[PDB]
Amino acid sequence: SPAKKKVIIIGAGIAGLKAASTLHQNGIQDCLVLEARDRVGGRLQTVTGYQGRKYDIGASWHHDTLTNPLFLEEAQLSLNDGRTRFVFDDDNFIYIDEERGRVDHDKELLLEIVDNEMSKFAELEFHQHLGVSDCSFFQLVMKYLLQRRQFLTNDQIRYLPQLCRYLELWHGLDWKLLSAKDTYFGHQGRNAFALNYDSVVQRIAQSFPQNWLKLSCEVKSITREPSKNVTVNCEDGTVYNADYVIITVPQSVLNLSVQPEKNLRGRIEFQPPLKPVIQDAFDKIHFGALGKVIFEFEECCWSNESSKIVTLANSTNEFVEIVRNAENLDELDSMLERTSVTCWSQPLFFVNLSKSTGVASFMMLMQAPLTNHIESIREDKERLFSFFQPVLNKIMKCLDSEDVIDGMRANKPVLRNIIVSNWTRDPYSRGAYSACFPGDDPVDMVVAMSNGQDSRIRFAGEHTIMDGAGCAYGAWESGRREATRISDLLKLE
Amino acid sequence: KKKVIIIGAGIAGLKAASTLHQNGIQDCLVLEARDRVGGRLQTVTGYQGRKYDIGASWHHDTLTNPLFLEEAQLSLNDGRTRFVFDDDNFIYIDEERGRVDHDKELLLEIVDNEMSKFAELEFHQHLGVSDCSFFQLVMKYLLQRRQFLTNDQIRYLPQLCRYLELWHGLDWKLLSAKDTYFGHQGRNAFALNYDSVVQRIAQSFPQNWLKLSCEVKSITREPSKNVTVNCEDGTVYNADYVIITVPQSVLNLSVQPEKNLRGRIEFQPPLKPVIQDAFDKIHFGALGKVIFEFEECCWSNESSKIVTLANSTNEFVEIVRNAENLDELDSMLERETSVTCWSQPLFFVNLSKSTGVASFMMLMQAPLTNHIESIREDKERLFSFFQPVLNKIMKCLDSEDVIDGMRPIENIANANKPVLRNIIVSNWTRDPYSRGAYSACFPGDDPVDMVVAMSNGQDSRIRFAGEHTIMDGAGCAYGAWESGRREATRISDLLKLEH
Ligand SMILES: Cc1cc2nc3c(=O)[nH]c(=O)nc-3n(C[C@H](O)[C@H](O)[C@H](O)COP(=O)(O)OP(=O)(O)OC[C@H]3O[C@@H](n4cnc5c(N)ncnc54)[C@H](O)[C@@H]3O)c2cc1C
Ligand SMILES: Cc1cc2nc3c(=O)[nH]c(=O)nc-3n(C[C@H](O)[C@H](O)[C@H](O)COP(=O)(O)OP(=O)(O)OC[C@H]3O[C@@H](n4cnc5c(N)ncnc54)[C@H](O)[C@@H]3O)c2cc1C
Ligand SMILES: CC(=O)N[C@@H](C)CCNCCCCN
Ligand SMILES: CC(=O)N[C@@H](C)CCNCCCCN
């Protein structure tokens, strides 16, 4: 009864998609790609909004374009047919405080310059100094302010910490939840905004047998037979027999396996259960919640100086005084004690799409915990508008325009629609991507994952590889990885 | 007669002396050829008594710079201003286009950043593997990334990225690509009187220890456990330990004949091969300075950092867009006279915004440095040479063309106009006791060799200190300083524990 297959890939995100592609490319046949959702792409999804305007609600950029193999591959295609597949949208960041207004490229604040010294400080703190404890990013910044207070103006001590928090939108984690040791990463080049990441999903997906794809099939268990074989069960009752399986479900979904209770959407029952080195790796790596909110306006009626804008959370002169009077980090923490969440309670990152793509919309990024709350009320459009109205306005103000007008039903910006991500509530997602809490060793997971459950049960995905960890191109490389090792193995006869 | 003889009263030698005295050592000498102390640290006086550092000006790497931190402690204690953090957002000026910085369409700093990462990637974990010129490296980047660069970026970026010439004092075709990028260990602090740093150290040991106008002609290492030293004036001194801090450029004269040269020290026994070999894998740059003193500030103080860009051509763009490969680029370029102020990038420090003084401290590089220092007395000529770039700056800073006011003459109808009252030029490439600015690398060099060669000394008695004898702070004021404490401590302990 259990139909035989050479390779069964679980999950049709970019990793599984690339794995299948690579398998077909190497002549392997009778493979299956089982996907729980009614679409392929996974954390890569392009949704439609006001008037057919398209937006990537998952991944948007090709990072590390100097070495990104996925990007270079896309780049080659565009060189051959002159088709626009992406756009380099890095720009000079415009920073905004609720009161103080724009604070970027400020001849007195010089925030970008001290920010640079701070990252140099962090680098010096961990590089070479083996054995140093981890601590949160926040604690790292406080330590910076303490050690360099003699060389910083009050205003710098007040705003730098708020401005350097934009790093939160890289990990999807608030600075108190983020591991300092993992905060700074080396960008290997500019970023390229994909103008349709779905084009990349479709191109790869159509590079292998259509019949290979089975959507709406939720894999519920995987068993290793003593007789060198792997059995897989979709919830629709069908059973499969395969030589090799490549599991690409998100780290957060895979985590569900190391827990009792199998009736959890997305959870896979492993038999034998996942090796201790794999189960334990979950105690040393976590999941962040980067989220998105798309603001669609009728038309652009604001300044297009830049395509990158970050709103700083509120700061206070009281904070400066505390930094000035604290004897040490201990006292500083104690002194920090002196009441509800707003759009100014954390930094927010807005992509002014008008300048980069011509679309009169804003693509905003948020982080945990704000993300979990916003996505939870993503259906209440008027409440979202109420929540994001003040920063929405402050922005228009700095961009030489007027207050936003709610038009979700002449010379002012009119909000037509609001789209929200839903990655934290989606059972086949459960967050955005792998991230580190303080004390986490992302390497434990990568190692346990790339070494597999055994010669037959493998893993791929953004959380299974070092180079490009947490990125679309990393997940892509892992797919290529696992598929190639198997291709080679299958060749031997 | 003497225990330790220090050659050179630069910051290196002055620290070595300060240290030795700090460790109770006595009967030491500081033999200095110039009639002043400080070496490449010299503060001059100009119009209305304004002071400027014609030599070193900044405390680099303030996050870890030990000399700066010592200065920082002194100021936290007495509240005396000893420095001011002057890093600023750079204003870039092109003759034809004007301001090209923080441009919403050129976004030059962003590609410059990428250019920088490409450089780290090209040399990262490969082991030497063909070291080219900073210029070549930039061409490779342009060729390799043209698909993701606009025409204006390919044109202006290479000109902007050349501010790095002002960090080595070397034109991009003479400069080693492998060494071009440094590790800016935090912000820079403009020393408001490096002469204060020099004076403090000079006055921290017996004043009778210092001997100015002493040109050491030769150092003799008598196998009978002792070192012989004699200045050009005939006097002879004897010491168990000798700390040589003459600059690398001066020291390099020893490994060459004709011991007639000024400042050259004849070594007997000669400097071992390891030492002499070092000079083949390291060189000297020529960072220079020109101070333009104005009556008063009448320009916008938006920034204290201003860089004028060398001219560029769309012609250059076209070649990049057409080159089939690297070798072809070289030809199309090698086939693509008169030096002017627009022939290279010039770095202008606007002192008005940082120190309140109506002057510009301009930095220049080789090959330009020697030419300008050569005419340092021809004020009129100096003015006609920089005039156009000076007006381009004033225009961009919402002001007017400069008026030559160096010769005592007055006119009332000139208050909203910048008035040049004086020009001061450095002279390091022509000073026989410095012969350049500091250690630098031509493509193919390897600084470590000299650092090792120097740090391990000629032997247990003849040692070396100076900006070129250390890794951390190489070519910097704190590097030489530390090298001084180094040789000092070592020699100090080899005497204290004795008896
Ligand atoms: C909001 C957001 C923004 C981001 N921005 C960027 C960016 O700009 N640049 C970048 O490079 N990366 C970005 N990322 C990360 C990037 O999207 C991921 O690294 C990438 O999508 C991971 O692909 P994957 O194949 O590893 O996992 P996935 O895309 O999650 O694929 C795994 C598949 O497994 C399926 N599945 C789960 N459980 C089962 C089951 N039991 N049975 C069958 N199928 C199942 C899931 O439905 C999913 O389709 C972002 C991510 C998010 C969420
Ligand atoms: C234009 C310029 C700008 C610079 N800017 C900076 C900066 O901003 N920040 C920074 O950290 N560094 C800067 N530097 C570098 C810094 O000036 C040097 O690294 C430092 O001054 C070197 O000190 P030293 O003791 O090693 O050598 P020196 O200062 O050259 O001292 C060596 C001494 O040896 C003496 N001497 C030579 N021959 C003999 C002889 N035969 N007998 C007796 N005495 C002799 C010389 O007169 C000299 O006084 C700059 C240098 C220059 C030239
Ligand atoms: C590793 C990490 O923190 N992030 C990777 C996985 C993707 C970040 N890119 C998403 C765009 C957010 C804007 N910085
Ligand atoms: C030996 C070495 O590579 N160091 C020299 C070339 C760099 C010195 N940098 C100090 C110059 C600061 C003034 N712009």
SS3 A223: strand
Would the CB of B485 count as within 6 Å of ligand 2?
no
Distance of CA A391 to CAs A95, A292, B492, Å? 12, 15, 64
Note the helical H segments in A66-175.
69-81, 111-126, 137-148, 154-163, 168-171
User: Where do the domains of chain B lie?
Assistant: 1-84+189-282+433-499, 85-188+283-432
In degrees and rounded to multiples of 5, residue A281 shows phi and psi of -60, -20
Closest CA to A99 of A397, A354, A447, A330: A397
Q: What would the two tokens of residue A223 be?
A: 């068993």
Amino acid identity at B417: K
SS3 A474: helix
Q: B288 alpha carbon to ligand 2 midpoint, in Å?
A: 13
Q: Which of A93, A107, A184, A399 to mutate to test the interface with B (most CBs of B within 10 A)?
A: A107
Instruction: List the residue whose alpha carbon is closest to atom 5 of ligand 4.
Output: B475
Contact, B110 vs A190, CB < 8 A? yes
Chain A residue at shortest CA distance from B63: A121
In whole angstroms, what is the distance from residue A465 CA to residue A462 CA?
7
Q: A396 alpha carbon to ligand 4 midpoint, in Å?
A: 46
HEC string of chain B equals CEEEEEECCEHHHHHHHHHHHHCCCCCEEEECCCCCCECCCCEEECHHHCEEECCCCEECCCCCCHHHHHHHHHHHHHCCCCEEECCCCCEEEECCCEECCCCCCCCHHHHHHHHHHHHHHHHCCCCCCCCCEHHHHHHHHHHHHHHHCCHHHHHHHHHHHHHHHHHHCECCCCCEHHHHCCCCCCCCEEECCHHHHHHHHHCCCCHHHEECCCCEEEEEEECCCEEEEEECCCCEEEEEEEEECCCHHHHCCCCCCCCCCCCCCEEECCCCHHHHHHCCCCEEECCEEEEEEECCCCCCCCCCEEEEECCCCHHHHHHHHHCCCHHHHHHHHHCCCCCCCCCCCEEEEEHHHHHCCCEEEEEECECHHHHHHHCCCCHHHHHHHHHHHHHHHHHHCCCCCCEECCCCCCCCCCCCCCEEEEEEECCCCCCCCCCCCEEECCCCCCHHHHHHHHHCCCCCCEEECCCCCCCCCCCCHHHHHHHHHHHHHHHHHHHHCCC
Q: B166 alpha carbon to ligand 4 midpoint, in Å?
A: 9
Contact, B7 vs B242, CB < 8 A? yes
In whole angstroms, what is the distance from residue A41 CA to residue A142 CA?
40
Contact, B158 vs B133, CB < 8 A? no
At the top level of CATH, the class of A88-191+286-427 is alpha beta
In whole angstroms, what is the distance from residue A180 CA to residue A178 CA?
6
Note the helical H segments in A185-238.
197-205
SS3 A296: strand
CATH topology of domain B85-188+283-432: Polyamine Oxidase; Chain A, domain 2 (3.90.660)
Contact, B301 vs B352, CB < 8 A? yes
Q: Which of A190, A191, A400 to mutate to test the interface with B (most CBs of B within 10 A)?
A: A190
A363: enclosing H helix or E strand: strand A361-366
Closest CA to A149 of A98, A114, A102, A107: A114
Q: Residue B27, CB half-sphere, CA atoms under 13 Å: how many?
A: 9
Contact, A35 vs A11, CB < 8 A? yes
In whole angstroms, what is the distance from residue B137 CA to residue B177 CA?
6
Closest CA to B163 of B118, B195, B116: B116
| Chain A residues lying within 8 Å of B104, measured CB to CB | 91-92, 305-306
Distance of CA A200 to CAs A326, A413, A473, B187, Å? 52, 33, 11, 43
Q: What would the two tokens of residue A60 be?
A: 């948007």
B110 — contact with chain A (CB < 8 Å)?
A: yes
Chain B residue at shortest CA distance from A304: B104
Q: How far apart are the first and last CA of chain B?
A: 18
Residue A287: Cβ-neighbour burial (10 angstroms; 0-12, 13-18, 19+): buried
Q: Beta strands B2-7 and B28-31: pairing type?
A: parallel
A84 — contact with chain B (CB < 8 Å)?
A: no
Closest CA to B287 of B58, B117, B103: B58
| Chain A residues lying within 8 Å of B64, measured CB to CB | 124
Which residues, other chains included, contact B409 with Cβ-Cβ below 8 Å and sequence gap of 6+?
Answer: none
In whole angstroms, what is the distance from residue B453 CA to residue B458 CA?
8
How close is the nearest chain B Cα to the Cα of A305, in Å?
Answer: 6
Amino acid identity at B35: D
Q: A469 alpha carbon to ligand 3 midpoint, in Å?
A: 9
Q: A43 alpha carbon to ligand 1 midpoint, in Å?
A: 3
CB contact under 8 A, A120 and B88: no
Would the CB of B440 count as within 6 Å of ligand 4?
yes
Closest CA to A53 of A233, A250, A166, A195: A195
In degrees and rounded to multiples of 5, residue B419 shows phi and psi of -115, 110
Contact, B385 vs B341, CB < 8 A? yes
Contact, A138 vs A175, CB < 8 A? yes
| Chain B residues lying within 8 Å of A85, measured CB to CB | none
Q: A171 alpha carbon to ligand 3 midpoint, in Å?
A: 6
Residue A350: Cβ-neighbour burial (10 angstroms; 0-12, 13-18, 19+): buried
How close is the nearest chain B Cα to the Cα of A431, in Å?
Answer: 31
Q: Beta strands A192-194 and A229-234: pairing type?
A: unpaired
| Chain A residues lying within 8 Å of B70, measured CB to CB | none
Contact, A134 vs A179, CB < 8 A? yes
Closest partner CB to A189 (pick from B76, B114, B147): B114
In whole angstroms, what is the distance from residue B248 CA to residue B435 CA?
9
In whole angstroms, what is the distance from residue A140 CA to residue A128 CA?
17
Would the CB of A31 count as within 6 Å of ligand 1?
no
CA B291, B296, B297, B298 dihedral sign is negative
A381: enclosing H helix or E strand: helix A381-398
| Chain A residues lying within 8 Å of B72, measured CB to CB | 150-151
Supply the angle between the helices B314-322 and B151-160 in degrees, to the nearest 10: 110
Atom from ligand 1 closest to the CA of residue A431: 53
Select from B6, B40, B451, B481 the residue to mutate for testing ligand 2; criterion: most ligand atoms less than 8 Å from CB. B40
Distance of CA A351 to CAs A25, A61, A92, A369, A397, Å? 37, 12, 12, 21, 16
Would the CB of B454 count as within 6 Å of ligand 4?
no
At the top level of CATH, the class of A1-87+192-285+428-493 is alpha beta
A189 — contact with chain B (CB < 8 Å)?
A: yes
A61: enclosing H helix or E strand: strand A61-62
Map tokens 């001194």 to a residue.
Answer: B237
HEC string of B104-169 equals CCCCHHHHHHHHHHHHHHHHCCCCCCCCCEHHHHHHHHHHHHHHHCCHHHHHHHHHHHHHHHHHHC
Select from A9, A33, A43, A366 the residue to mutate for testing ligand 1; criterion: most ligand atoms less than 8 Å from CB. A43
In whole angstroms, what is the distance from residue A273 CA to residue A223 CA?
9
CB contact under 8 A, A110 and B88: yes
User: Chain-centre distance of CA B288, in angstroms?
Assistant: 7
At the top level of CATH, the class of B1-84+189-282+433-499 is alpha beta
Q: Beta strands A54-56 and A61-62: pairing type?
A: unpaired
Interface of A with B in 291-320 (CB under 8 A): 305-306
Q: What would the two tokens of residue A301 be?
A: 């009626």
In whole angstroms, what is the distance from residue A430 CA to residue A442 CA?
18
Would the CB of B447 count as within 6 Å of ligand 4?
yes
Closest partner CB to B121 (pick from A66, A110, A305): A66
In whole angstroms, what is the distance from residue B245 CA to residue B239 CA?
16
CB contact under 8 A, B76 and A150: yes
Closest CA to A117 of A75, A166, A164: A164
SS3 A194: strand
| Chain B residues lying within 8 Å of A112, measured CB to CB | 89
In degrees and rounded to multiples of 5, residue B92 shows phi and psi of -110, 130
Would the CB of B141 count as within 6 Å of ligand 4?
no
CA A20, A21, A23, A29 dihedral sign is positive
CB contact under 8 A, B118 and A66: yes
In whole angstroms, what is the distance from residue A152 CA to residue A150 CA?
6
Q: Residue A155, CB half-sphere, CA atoms under 13 Å: how many?
A: 11
In whole angstroms, what is the distance from residue A429 CA to residue A127 CA?
34
A72 — contact with chain B (CB < 8 Å)?
A: no
Would the CB of B425 count as within 6 Å of ligand 2?
no
CB contact under 8 A, A66 and B109: no
Closest partner CB to A120 (pick from B88, B114, B186): B186
In whole angstroms, what is the distance from residue B42 CA to residue B434 CA?
12
Amino acid identity at A196: N
Closest CA to B417 of B435, B430, B407, B405: B405
Supply the angle between the helices A137-148 and A111-126 in degrees, to the nearest 10: 110
Rg (C-alpha) for chain A, rounded Å, is 24
B196-218 burial, b at 16+ Cβ within 10 Å, e below that, comes to bbbeebbeebeeebbbeebbbbb
Q: How far apart are the first and last CA of chain A?
A: 26
Select from B201, B246, B291 the residue to mutate for testing ligand 2; criterion: most ligand atoms less than 8 Å from CB. B246
SS3 A280: helix
A224-246 burial, b at 16+ Cβ within 10 Å, e below that, comes to beeeeebbbbbeeeeebebbbbb
CA A322, A324, A328, A329 dihedral sign is positive
Contact, B354 vs B190, CB < 8 A? yes
B186 — contact with chain A (CB < 8 Å)?
A: yes
Interface of B with A in 148-167 (CB under 8 A): 148
B386-425 burial, b at 16+ Cβ within 10 Å, e below that, comes to bebbbebbbebbebeebeebbeeeeeeeeeebbbbbbbbb
